[PDB]
């Protein structure tokens, strides 16, 4: 489910945040994504 | 058989330490 404030637990990385579609360019060996200051940015869906 | 000549690697031999997307 997307576009709502949902408690999320992707691959053991737990937290709270709204989720939606993204136009990232993930490489095949890539799972997570961070930014310049080391916080989880985008997660590839393991089942999607 | 083989030799043991020594050369320089130049700029070479770099892999991604992790699997985390980054840009700019």
């Amino acid at each position: 489910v997307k576009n709502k404030c949902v408690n999320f637990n992707f691959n053991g990385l737990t937290g709270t945040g709204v989720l939606t579609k993204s136009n990232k360019k993930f490489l095949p060996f890539q799972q997570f994504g961070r930014d310049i200051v080391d916080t989880t940015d985008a997660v590839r869906d393991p089942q999607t | 058989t083989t030799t043991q000549s020594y050369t320089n690697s130049f700029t070479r031999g770099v892999y991604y330490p992790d699997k985390v997307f980054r840009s700019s």
């Binding site: - | 690697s9 031999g13 770099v14 840009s23 700019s24």
Partner: protein, 32 residues
């Protein structure tokens, strides 16, 4: 088997800095 290679290097803990392209690849690296 048959009827100019073998380049072997040795890595040590060294700090590196890698330029990540906007797509997510790496384009330049410098040794510290």
């Amino acid at each position: 088997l048959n009827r100019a290679d073998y380049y072997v290097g040795y890595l040590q803990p060294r700090t590196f800095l890698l330029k990540y392209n906007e797509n997510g690849t790496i384009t330049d690296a410098v040794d510290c």
